[PDB]
């Protein structure tokens, strides 16, 4: 089973600044990593699939990058609507696993 | 349409249906087996081509008994199709050579 | 649209079972897998299992105690998860998601809040909160409403049936002797009240109750 | 039963016996060689198919001299069988084309 | 030769509670891991083969999970008959090796 480590757990940035969330996989998964946003009492929402590919609906503000074991979601110019919990998830090997998650905090 | 060209063509269509059924069935067979990489439809389709041609890179392979049984049908459809094209080409050349010898 | 449709809540007694549902709409291919994800309060997401309705073939998370049994009814485009012999470890929100077989959850349900308790279902009492007669207002004015004595969670509080988005807080419930209580706050330009009407609407899915309550100045 | 279809069939049965003997003998050859993965009968059988078809994914392979000698016999039985089916198909098509030309 | 590390060596749980024993492999072995129970002066007894597959004879209480290098035997609702020594064993690569073992203790 693959282990998605998201450190740190909370991330404090100032309004308008660039923010980066890390996901490390326990073994190489290519780019088979996807990111979800969960606001207070919302459902998760696909933001990025396959590490860097955009979902339409999603501010261009959101990017992702990475390959092998090291993955990063970036929000360039954090705004208040970004306050949420961010999760990574792998589809490289059965079963699908999630990250522990990261709270963004302005 | 001679037999050999109808057969060659039939084998081409049938190989395409086997690549697709095999992609579907491999994913179905492989999910539930921890560590299995053969578990989404797009790369399963890549896997089925790579197996049917016998290139077999090994980036992907089935690890379950039913994944492996499916893989055996893809290998054999692929080797037989491509062998049935070679045999149809051999049938063309032999006829041409007879006609040329004046036979 | 809404692609996955889940009930908002079920109460279940310790040792009882429950059958969660998920009605899909939009494009429903043969290739599609339905997934179930479990989020315990203030915890992260846990993959619980997957079913392919076309073949009815189902896989489970084997890293945890097996409580789930996944079934699909292809006629009524509906996925079911039977959760049996539940303790309080099993109290959580359970989402269904749709994966097209390329490995990511495109579309989620709103999730079903499953409370495992021996308590009983109580609809909320709803109470206006207009300001006291001795309070100097400004360019804005804060009204609210008081949802108390409900079980189980959750409740849904809207302001004028959804049309009032800006200015709204709803506070988290507290738990007193087997009953929950929260408050919601709204803040409107003082001119626009009470000339223009302000109503809190309060659904409680576990009891099928939805009450409106108007906020008038105090008699 | 023409020769070519009897031979094709004979080669199919014989390939199945070689897959089985080869599975058995590879395991026997490979246990005792530290790091060897080719060491239980069920995946040895998978290995023998993957070698005989020439897909050769490389999830499994023999690392001993006798494992490798066994593997060479499986490769050659497999290439010859599948070549003997191609040759039998070519014999069918040529006959049909003669009959059609009116020959 | 593959190295099966079982930590911790002793595991103290209360009656009725869930217990997990870890086996880490020195290199990836797929699911080619099997677990044995040995009671005081008994022979070992197959409990789980291939990481998660059940042996008939064995309380449904016993489960296993894991893939690559990280494996786990679980007993949901430990009872007194479970007091024993638990060993893991790999069949991925020659030769077969055992874990050092873990005493369960109520």
Numbering used by the authors:
A (entry chain B), E (entry chain B): 1 to 106
B (entry chain C), D (entry chain C): 22 to 124
C (entry chain A): 1 to 219
Publication excerpt:
The E71V channel in its closed-gate conformation was crystallized, and individual crystals were subsequently soaked in low potassium solution (5 mM KCl). Closed-gate E71V KcsA structures have resolutions in the range of 2.7–2.9 Å, whereas the resolutions of the open-gate structures are in the range of 3.0–3.3 Å. The conformation of the closed inner gate of E71V is identical to that in WT KcsA, and the Cα-Cα distance between Thr112 of the TM2 helix is 12 Å for both channels. For the closed-gate E71V with Ba2+ or K+ ions, the conformation of the selectivity filter is highly stable during 500 ns MD simulations. In both trajectories, Ba2+ or K+ ions predominantly bound at the same sites as the initial conformation. In comparison with the other simulations, the selectivity filter of the closed-gate E71V bound with Ba2+/K+ was very stable with a G77 Cα-Cα cross-subunit distance of ~8 Å, indicative of a canonical conductive filter.
In particular, a glutamic acid residue at position 71 along the pore helix in KcsA is substituted by a valine conserved in most Kv channels, suggesting that this side chain is a molecular determinant of function. On the other hand, MD simulations indicate that the constricted conformation can nonetheless be stably established in the mutant channel. Together, these findings suggest that the Kv-like KcsA mutant may be associated with different modes of C-type inactivation, showing that distinct filter environments entail distinct C-type inactivation mechanisms.
